[PDB]
Amino acid sequence: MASRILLNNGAKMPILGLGTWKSPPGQVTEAVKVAIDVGYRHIDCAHVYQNENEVGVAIQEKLREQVVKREELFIVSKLWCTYHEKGLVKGACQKTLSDLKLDYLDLYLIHWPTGFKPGKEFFPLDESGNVVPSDTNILDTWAAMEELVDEGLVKAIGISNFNHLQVEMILNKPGLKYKPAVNQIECHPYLTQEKLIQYCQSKGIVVTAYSPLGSPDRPWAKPEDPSLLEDPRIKAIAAKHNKTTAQVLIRFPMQRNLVVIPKSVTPERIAENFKVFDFELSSQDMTTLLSYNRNWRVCGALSCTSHKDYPFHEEF
Ligand SMILES: NC(=O)c1ccc[n+]([C@@H]2O[C@H](COP(=O)([O-])OP(=O)(O)OC[C@H]3O[C@@H](n4cnc5c(N)ncnc54)[C@H](OP(=O)(O)O)[C@@H]3O)[C@@H](O)[C@H]2O)c1
């Protein structure tokens, strides 16, 4: 298992990264410092997570300490839904760069295919609770992303939570200049994503698996929801390999040629989650884990279900 995967922009992306959604601002600086100290070279960020300033403090300190060089890091962020308009994309990217204290991103993603009305609120609502869309379309937002490459702000551009017809819309865009390098999607044994993964990989688009542990800290969790980390069948596979359940859940996407971005703020877990390059799941293990699919989504975008670009009506 090599540590990096080749993207269709010619750059190499570390297959293991640190997630930062829900990482409290008063803990994420230490989390990222520890991660870099124990070998992580890829951090997954987003403006909407409201902690990029604190992530940036950690990155900058480790660069200043010469623990790593900038070229060895792979920093990812995402354009939030209220910035899909042509005239807002550059400023949104620049705010993320300023907060992360970087002069380029390795990868910048359209966070969701749905554009929302610009303004201070990340989820602008009408008086009856529906998200207010913007009349921007995917293709014009993509052209704005391409301009970021040509201005030197980002090395690669990609998409997140795009279904296969939305990916196809970009691939078929008139005048397409840069293909998406990555589609970042939810993926784990309860949402195995075979169809969308095969489609993206067949087009040379690398898939990143988010919520690989089932996001046990997601704010809308209910006690009755399935729990990957507690699933006795997954625990049994981990026991057989003398690894933790989380380690199996991280190794699983790696062996499907995916990038994976588990989140933790706990130093011991940050280190544990990186120790996944020393064992192999068998083909039988892989097929058994795939068999647990139940089309269960952590991130269903349930308040956007009437948006014209809502991604999860299509089968994939
Ligand atoms: N593009 C998108 O729309 C999108 C959506 C969702 C997520 N993401 C990205 O993907 C990242 C990962 O997904 P996620 O944050 O939803 O959840 P996740 O990585 O599946 O799970 C994170 C949770 O697992 C716990 N955990 C981590 N390592 C563990 C271990 N070894 N043993 C036991 N528990 C462990 C963490 O606890 P502690 O932190 O307390 O240790 C935290 O509660 C996000 O942070 C974000 O960067 C992107």
Delimit the domains of the chain by residue range.
Answer: 1-316
Q: How many whole angstroms separate alpha carbon 82 and alpha carbon 89?
A: 10
266 lines ligand 1 (CB under 6 A): yes
Closest among 7, 29, 2, 5 to 18, alpha carbons compared: 29
- Mutate which of 27, 28, 40, 264 for ligand 1? The one with the most ligand atoms within 8 Å of its CB, which is 264
Closest CA to 15 of 23, 26, 6: 6
Residues 6 or more apart in contact with residue 268 via CB below 8 angstroms: none
State the binding site for NADP(+): 10-19, 211-273
Q: How far apart are the CA of 30 and the centre of ligand 1, in A?
A: 16
Sequence-distant (6+) residues with CB within 8 A of 309 are: 113, 114, 115, 137, 138, 166
Please give the Cα distance from 196 to 192 (Å, whole number).
9
Output the DSSP codes for 123-141.
S-B-TTS-B-B-S--HHHH
Give the active site residues. 49
Provide the b/e sequence for 246-270 (b: ≥16 CB within 10 Å).
bbbbbbbbbebebbbbbbbbebebb
The burial of 233, by beta-carbon neighbours within 10 Å (0-12 exposed, 13-18 middle, 19 or more buried), is given as exposed
Q: Whose CA is nearest to atom 21 of ligand 1?
A: 215
* 263 within ligand 1 shell (Cβ under 6 A): yes
Ligand 1 atom closest to Cα of residue 270: 28
Q: Residue 251: CB partners within 8 Å, gap ≥ 6? A: 243, 276, 279, 280, 281
Q: Which residues are annotated as a binding site for substrate?
A: 111
> Is 159 close to ligand 1, i.e. is its CB under 6 Å away?
no
Q: Which atom of ligand 1 is nearest to the CA of 18?
A: 47
Q: How was this structure determined?
A: X-ray
| Ligand 1 atom at minimal distance to the Cα of residue 160 | 1
Instruction: Judge if the beta carbon of residue 193 lies within 6 A of ligand 1.
Output: no
> Which residues have C-beta within 8 Å of that of residue 233, sequence separation ≥ 6?
288, 292
